[PDB]
Structures are given as structure tokens and as C-alpha cells.
Design a protein around this ligand. Structure first.
Ligand SMILES: O=C(O)Cc1ccccc1
Ligand SMILES: [Ca+2]
Lengths: 557, 206
């Protein structure tokens, strides 16, 4: 999920612009829910996932807010010591402590019910995997016991009227989430919120720790430690699940890294390119980032250095020249099936070959697999989520950077071979593979584009609609499942703020018994496809003037 | 009046609720949610509590077992019980509102029952604050803020230390899975600030 907040110093025809694109995949009915609340201290408009009480994407006419997953390390695993003689117990601080346990029964449609036990320790629920007679792992979340507080903080934050009131709420949100702020005066802010553990000296947060007691967390770090910035000198705040702050450590996931190669640069670039941006320009960044190949910029210089001394007639040479002329912005051909340029296919084949030759070659099986993905892998239905630079690619990037990289190359991923040679060998595989499939005339190569699918099953893989309700979109776009933009103090409007969003397929997922689909079942699907957007109203007058229907309930609690 | 809940929908069907107190506000919210995404929410409820098999069958038993094994319901309930009256009103109001609509739905299903319920062979039931809380808990928390691979990580490190030896192994682990990388583009510029904490990257816990 991405987000960019443009402040007073970089906003054109406005004081602040917030553009947010949460990415959780695409679903039907829509991932988020459009809602406006007015009363009980609230006055907001926006949309929110699964219709949470609190709006994750919205504004209250004074400030606006958004999020992107933080991917900080707020989870550690404790290796508990068990005893075959003491089932149900574990050793903690010199005493055999009784675990928590509960009986669960899975009722099964047209099947036999199934009962089992779930076990928990002072560190958290016991994992099913990796169990022995003497060991069990408990997953410890720094946010454990703060689920509701986070739900409430996400709600109360909607009432904030300034940085201080808002951060007060951000301090109560315990999940690892990036919160962003913007207001009518052109102030902008960012907080990498969440509960983070105060670990014992010597604790490597990337590896498990003994659950016997000596490695228990001291407690939780204070809000002071949470990365945050208010009105940065840069004049903008951009994030795409990249690092919040210098020296801030990332999630322990082996497949997740914050290194030199990061997709957020694609956004920084567009924001620095222009001294000031208008709302339309800020919104356009969605379109551009959604079509931007994320690997071209990373490896092109390497591809260039390796092929700089080859003759025109060398096919490897022309592949790179093809990439050199490309902006990396994929566009669909008239067939709505293929891409105008073959760059992503070239990069994909090459990158795959480079990883296999380098990173994959240096890692022992079966861990080698973790570094083989090029990041272009997909099915016929298209990506189930955002596209990113693969972990293998990021590691490879550090390697091709040579001394410019601050990561010691403990082992040479090129195993003593000149990098140029390995890069050339991969280019050769690329030309062989592609030329044999598309012919020897690159100029008429029509490579497959990725498509996008609004899936009928929710991110859990659970049906939330009939299969037939699945929707398709020719062009895959690396963008938010939804996109919303808030513009404060727009100069061309009579309102102190303007906002827009797009909730595809539509506000409603309702289908009557006779199959009659609701009027708002699919009226935002084409809008999503063409990077369109519709207005979010806030004031009583705006809502009234754009009223479609009304209803008044009278009920006593 | 204090008991009035106005619901105004705009030209895209987006609802705007108007109410005096908290419970009434979120009652309106839940009402419209039940109207727009009842099947979606019912299945999301089952996703977050692990009761999908009950309606979809054997292919979801493992999914269900995994969900229930990844949280502690009683802990969620205790958190709800400790909520102040005002905060409770949020979850209670939201639940009640959904229930008002669900009741109308199960009274006149021939016109109000979303087709999917007929298709998947069941009908919707009442919601309690727990259910509402769990939609958020089960998605945002148990899924989007619950990431770790430390066990796999240690396996890798072990394999690396066996392949390259202890010292070089550790160093390679810090090459493929570095703790921090100073060249990483950050949302906050270095001129602004940096993170004070320094962490162990030698797995000293062993
Ligand atoms: O799923 C995601 O990573 C996007 C998201 C981040 C934070 C809150 C809602 C959605
Ligand atoms: Ca960890």
C-alpha cells in the first residue's frame, strides 16, 4: 500500500494533498465501505475496510488521515520448554507454569464435527508447526491485549483537530501501521505507529528466543521511539511499505527487506521532479506508479555497463538498448491483451536467470527457493496483490552496487566471475528464450500484459460472493485496491477542502433473491479502470445537494 | 429527537448517518452496512472466527482450525468488558443496527434476503459486539500485523553456518536478511531524525 502527502511548500493551488492507496488485493464486493458519520462528536467522510467503526481513509473537514502497512517487527517467537512428564505445562522463571487451553469444535456442513485444543502461554498462542516432546513455539505480539484499543484509536482519531490531538490517538494504535496526517492549514505528518517490544540486550529480533524467562521482553517501547515527522523539510511524505526512518528495523520475514532497492523511490522521483504539484498531478502519480516496471531503474545501469563494449549486431546489446529507450511505463496494445513494449518480459527473464546464477546459487537448499522469484510471477487472473521488487532482486541489487552498497558481501554472489560476464550470460538466456518464442524482430514482440481480477473470495480465500460475481479488468495496475485523495484549502473551490475516492466495484454488494443487482453494485468499476474518481461529500449542504435517498429511524436503546 | 437516526445516501449509494449520541450513530452505521454488504460481512465474520466450514464444508476445516489457533477469544471478550460505556456504545450500537436490518431480512426474505444466502444454503444471524470487534481484529491485526518467520529464519542461518562455517555463516545471514540497511529509502529524511535503537545481529540469544 502506498501514500504520498504533499505539504504547503510543495502543493500547487492548495495547501496540502493526501493520496492513499491501500493494497490488499481486489475483491467483489469492494474491499472497502463508503461511510459518512455526523454526530456524537464525529463529522467525517471516507471509506474503510470491512466497514470498521473507524475510517482508515477519510477526513473531517479540518484534518485528513490514511494508512499503509508498517511492516515493523512487532512479533517475536519464544521457544518454550516442555516436559513429557508435565503435559500442559512449560518452564518459565524456574517454575512449571500451566498453559492456557480451550476446546474448540469445528462444525462442518455435510461433514463430521471436529474437536481440538488450542494452547497458549505467557508469550502467546502455541504454534502447530515445529513441535517436539521437548519444544513448542509461542508467537508473541507486542500488540497482544491491545486489539480493541487499536480499533478505538482508529475511531477516536477521526475527532482530532490538530497534530497533538491526533498523535494522542496514534499513540494508542498498537498494530504496526503507518499513519499519516494532513490539515486545512497545509500541515502534514507521519507516524509509524504500533506497539514495539523493549528487547533484552543481545536479543536478535530476527530469530527465536528461549521462553524460559531470561529473554522475556522488558516491556514496550514508548511513543517517543515511534518514527514520526511533522512538516518535514522535504515538503512531502511518501511511503510504499518502505522504511519509516534511518536505522529503523524491518519485519523479520525472510522475504521482506528495506534496502537500496525500494519501490517507494518511484514515488519520491515523481514528487521531486516538480517543485509543486496540483491535485490532478498528485492523483496522476497513481496512474504512473501503477504502470511503472519496478526493476528497470534498479538494473539498467548494470545492463548498460555490461553491454557498453559490444557491437550493434549483438542481440544482448539490442535488448539493453530496447530497455534504455523505455520509460518502463507499461501500456496495453489495442488488443487489450499485450504490452506495447517488451521490457518487463526482458527484465523478467533476465532477472530470473541472474538470481538463479547468483543468490540462488549461494544459498543451500531448500532455502534457495526463497530467492528465485523475479517478482513478475503471476497467474492467468493476474496478481493477487501489489507488485514489488523481489527479495532476491533486492539482495542482487546490493551485489551489483559493489562498494556503493553498505551491506558487506560476506560471500560473492558472482563466485569470482566478473559481474559483466554473468550479466552477459543472462542476457544471452533472455534473447534465446524470448527470440525463440516471439521471433528475432523485437519491434513486433507482443508480450502478455498482466490483467486484474476482482475476486469473489476475500483475502482469506473465503467466498464473500458467488463465483460468477468475479469481475475482470484488462489492465493490471499496481495501485491501491481503493484510492482516495483529500485536498486542503483548494484555491479553485468554495470549500476549505475537497475529497474524492473510488470504491470498485461499487458501494453495494446486494443482489435481491430474484438476482436483481443493486443500482450501486457496479457503478464504480469503469471509473476504477480509467483512473477516475468521484466526490466525497462532508457538509450537510453537500450531502443534501447530492442526495439520492433518505430514511429516518426512530429507536430507543 | 434523541432517538432519531437519519440516513442519507448520495449519488453513489454512499451512506451518511446523522445521530445525536454514540449508540445511535453506530446503529445507523451498522444498519446501512447490513443493507449493503450483509453476505460480505457474514462471510468475513466466519473468516475471522473460523466458522466457515459450518456453511461451506470440509474444504475449510483446516482454514477454520488455523484461525481459531491464531487468537484467544476470551482475551478479546475481556477487552470488550473493560470498555467504558461510551466506547462500548460504538460496538454495541454497530451490532444492534445490523440486527435491526437482519430482523427485517429474516421477516421478509422473499424480497430482502441477499441471493447468496439462498445460493450457499443458509440465513444470517444476529451480531454481538464481539463479532464486530473481530472483523477488525481478524483482518487488521491477526492478518496484517502478525508477520514473522523467525523459525524459518533460524533454519536458514543454521544451514548457512553449516555451509560457510559459523563466522561466515552469520555474516551471510546478515547479507541476505540484514537487520538494517542504511541505503534504504526512508519516508523520513535523515536530516529529520534517525531511530536510536541498535539491535543484536549475532543471534546472541544462543
Ligand atoms: O493491506 C494493506 O497492507 C493496506 C492497509 C494498510 C493499513 C490499513 C488498511 C489497509
Ligand atoms: Ca521478530
Amino acid at each position: 500500500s502506498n501514500m504520498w502527502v504533499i505539504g504547503k511548500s510543495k502543493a500547487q493551488d492548495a495547501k496540502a494533498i493526501m493520496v492513499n492507496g491501500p493494497q490488499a488485493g481486489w475483491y467483489a464486493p469492494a474491499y472497502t465501505y463508503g461511510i459518512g458519520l455526523h454526530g456524537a462528536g464525529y463529522d467525517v467522510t471516507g471509506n474503510t475496510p470491512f466497514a470498521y467503526p473507524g475510517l482508515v481513509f477519510g477526513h473531517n473537514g479540518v484534518i485528513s488521515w490514511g494508512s499503509t502497512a508498517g511492516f515493523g517487527d512487532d512479533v517475536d517467537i519464544f521457544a518454550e520448554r516442555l516436559s513429557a512428564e508435565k503435559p500442559g505445562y512449560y518452564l518459565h522463571n524456574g517454575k512449571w507454569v500451566k498453559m492456557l487451553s480451550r476446546e474448540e469444535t469445528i462444525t462442518v456442513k455435510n461433514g463430521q464435527a471436529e474437536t481440538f485444543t488450542v494452547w497458549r502461554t505467557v508469550h502467546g498462542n502455541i504454534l502447530q508447526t515445529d513441535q517436539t516432546t521437548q519444544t513448542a513455539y509461542a508467537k508473541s505480539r507486542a500488540w497482544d491485549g491491545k486489539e480493541l484499543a487499536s480499533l478505538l484509536a482508529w475511531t477516536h482519531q477521526m475527532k482530532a483537530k490538530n497534530w497533538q490531538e491526533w498523535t494522542q490517538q496514534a499513540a494508542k494504535q498498537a498494530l504496526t501501521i503507518n499513519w499519516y496526517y494532513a490539515d486545512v492549514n497545509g500541515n502534514i505528518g507521519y507516524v509509524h505507529t504500533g506497539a514495539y517490544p523493549d528487547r533484552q540486550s543481545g536479543h536478535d529480533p530476527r530469530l527465536p528466543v528461549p521462553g524460559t524467562g531470561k529473554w522475556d521482553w522488558k516491556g514496550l517501547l514508548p511513543f517517543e521511539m515511534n518514527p514520526k515527522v511533522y512538516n518535514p523539510q522535504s515538503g512531502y511524505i511518501a511511503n510504499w511499505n518502505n522504511s519509516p526512518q534511518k536505522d529503523y528495523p524491518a519485519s523479520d520475514l525472510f522475504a521482506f527487506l528495506w534496502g537500496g532497492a525500494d519501490r517507494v523511490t518511484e514515488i519520491d522521483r515523481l514528487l521531486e521532479q516538480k517543485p509543486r504539484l496540483t491535485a490532478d498531478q498528485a492523483w496522476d502519480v497513481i496512474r504512473q506508479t501503477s504502470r511503472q516496471d519496478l526493476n528497470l531503474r534498479l538494473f539498467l545501469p548494470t545492463l548498460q555497463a555490461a553491454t557498453s563494449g559490444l557491437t550493434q549486431s549483438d542481440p544482448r546489446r539490442q535488448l539493453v538498448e530496447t530497455l534504455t529507450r523505455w520509460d518502463g511505463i507499461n501500456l496495453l496494445n489495442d488488443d487489450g491483451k499485450t504490452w506495447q513494449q517488451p521490457g518487463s518480459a526482458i527484465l523478467n527473464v533476465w532477472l530470473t536467470s541472474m538470481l538463479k546464477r547468483t543468490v540462488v546459487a549461494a544459498v543451500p537448499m531448500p532455502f534457495d527457493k526463497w530467492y528465485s522469484a523475479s517478482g513478475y510471477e503471476t497467474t492467468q487472473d493476474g496478481p493477487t496483490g501489489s507488485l514489488n521488487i523481489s527479495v532476491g532482486a533486492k539482495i542482487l541489487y546490493e551485489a551489483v552496487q559493489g562498494d556503493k552498497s553498505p551491506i558487506p558481501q560476506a560471500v560473492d554472489l558472482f563466485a569470482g566471475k566478473p559481474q559483466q560476464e554473468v550479466v552477459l550470460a543472462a542476457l544471452e538466456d533472455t534473447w534465446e528464450t524470448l527470440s525463440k518464442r516471439y521471433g528475432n524482430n523485437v519491434s513486433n514482440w507482443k508480450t502478455p500484459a498482466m490483467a486484474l481480477t476482482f475476486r469473489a473470495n476475500n483475502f482469506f480465500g473465503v467466498p464473500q460472493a458467488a463465483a460468477e460475481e468475479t469481475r475482470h479488468q484488462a489492465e493490471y495496475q499496481n495501485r491501491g485496491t481503493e484510492n482516495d485523495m483529500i485536498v486542503f484549502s483548494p484555491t479553485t473551490s468554495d470549500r476549505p477542502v475537497l475529497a474524492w475516492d473510488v470504491v470498485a466495484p461499487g458501494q453495494s454488494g446486494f443482489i435481491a433473491p430474484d438476482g436483481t443487482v443493486d443500482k450501486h453494485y457496479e457503478d464504480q468499476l469503469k471509473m476504477y479502470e480509467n483512473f477516475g474518481r468521484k466526490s466525497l461529500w462532508l457538509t450537510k449542504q453537500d450531502v443534501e445537494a447530492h442526495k439520492e435517498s433518505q430514511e429516518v429511524l426512530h429507536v430507543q436503546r | 429527537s434523541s432517538s432519531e437516526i437519519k440516513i442519507v445516501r448520495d449519488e453513489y449509494g454512499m451512506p451518511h448517518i446523522y445521530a445525536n449520541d454514540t449508540w445511535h450513530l453506530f446503529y445507523g452505521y451498522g444498519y446501512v452496512v447490513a443493507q449493503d454488504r450483509l453476505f460480505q460481512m457474514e462471510m468475513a465474520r466466519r473468516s475471522t472466527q473460523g466458522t466457515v466450514a459450518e456453511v461451506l464444508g470440509k474444504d475449510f476445516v483446516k482454514f477454520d482450525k488455523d484461525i481459531r489457533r491464531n487468537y484467544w477469544p476470551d482475551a478479546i471478550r475481556a477487552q470488550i468488558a473493560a470498555l467504558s460505556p461510551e466506547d462500548m456504545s460504538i460496538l454495541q450500537g454497530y451490532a444492534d443496527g445490523m440486527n435491526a436490518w437482519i430482523d427485517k431480512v429474516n421477516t421478509n426474505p422473499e424480497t430482502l434476503l441477499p441471493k447468496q444466502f439462498n445460493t450457499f444454503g443458509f440465513t444470517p444471524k444476529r451480531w454481538e459486539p464481539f463479532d464486530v470487534a473481530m472483523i477488525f481484529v481478524g483482518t487488521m491485526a491477526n492478518r496484517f500485523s502478525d508477520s514473522t518467520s523467525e523459525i524459518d529464519n533460524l533454519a536458514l542461518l543454521t544451514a548457512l553456518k553449516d555451509k560457510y562455517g559459523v563466522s561466515q555463516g552469520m555474516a551471510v545471514f546478515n547479507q541476505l536478511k540484514w537487520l538494517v540497511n542504511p541505503s534504504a529509502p526512508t519516508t523520513i529524511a535523515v536530516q529529520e531524525s534517525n531511530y536510536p535503537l541498535k539491535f543484536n545481529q549475532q543471534n546472541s540469544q544462543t
